[PDB]
Ligand binder design. Structure first.
Ligand code: A1EAC
Lengths: 11, 227
């Protein structure tokens, strides 16, 4: 999970 | 009283510009004064506020040197604390309002009945006491960096770098306070007590979230991913 957060962090 | 070193001025420069670049407006001239229906109106303005916090962390090189799962844990832990501090420093005693997203004045009662409960009181009382502190963009930025680099967040892997980063910020932020000579006694001890207050707010957002979980679909997806 945390897919949206992980997208915003990986630019 | 030791004043900042050269390397600490550079760290202050980085964190202050990161904060200013991700802090909405800069607000009292934009304010738009304002029960799942109040909860809906609040859920649907929160995703920009969470994203600004993400952009602030990404502008800190020490944060970028961490693995993405520690990065995720670190945002999830400090997101509401930073958003609460940013609203508390925008307390207007004449209107008794906080400013959300740089343009939305809210009252104690509006924000409480919007879903935060007694956490609304805690943020408002924090904004009241922060008036006589006269914090600038730098002192707020450093507060956000201290909260972000919390090595006690559950699940972290680089516990001992994160605690080193925080110790760096904590020292540069104390020397800045020495350099700045606020007309308040025992200022650095009182600031550390405010860090405790914001950490209390962070864990009480969490309790209020479990209480609110209303169908999960009605909660926006980033709001769900933070908690
Ligand atoms: C921290 O409180 C806020 N601050 C801002 C903001 O902009 N901060 C100023 C800045 O960053 O400059 C917001 O936009 C907020 C939007 C909605 C909000 O409602 C909530 C939030 C969390 C909840 C947890 C559990 C139950 C109910 C809840 C309701 C709070 C906001």
């Amino acid at each position: 999970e945390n897919a949206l957060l992980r997208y915003l962090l990986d630019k | 009283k030791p004043e900042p070193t050269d390397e600490e001025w550079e760290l202050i420069k980085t964190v202050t510009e990161a904060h200013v670049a991700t802090n909405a407006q800069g607000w009292k001239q934009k304010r738009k004064f304002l029960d799942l229906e109040a909860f809906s109106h609040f859920t649907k303005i929160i995703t920009p506020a969470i994203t600004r916090v993400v952009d602030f962390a990404k502008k800190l090189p020490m944060f970028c040197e961490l693995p993405c799962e520690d990065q995720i844990i670190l945002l999830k832990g400090c997101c509401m604390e930073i958003m609460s501090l940013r609203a508390a420093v925008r307390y207007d005693p004449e209107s008794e309002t906080l400013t959300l997203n740089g343009e939305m004045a809210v009252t104690r009662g509006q924000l409480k009945n919007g879903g935060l409960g007694v956490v609304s009181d805690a943020i408002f009382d924090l904004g009241m006491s922060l008036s006589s502190f006269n914090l600038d963009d730098t002192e707020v930025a450093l507060l956000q960096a201290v909260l972000l680099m919390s090595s006690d967040r559950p699940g972290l892997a680089c516990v001992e770098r994160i605690e080193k980063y925080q110790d760096s910020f904590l020292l540069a932020f104390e020397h800045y306070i020495n350099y700045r000579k606020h007309h308040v006694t025992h200022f650095w001890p009182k600031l550390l007590m405010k860090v405790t207050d914001l950490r209390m707010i962070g864990a009480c957002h969490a309790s209020r979230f479990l209480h609110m979980k209303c169908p999960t679909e009605l909660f926006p997806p980033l709001f769900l991913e933070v908690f």
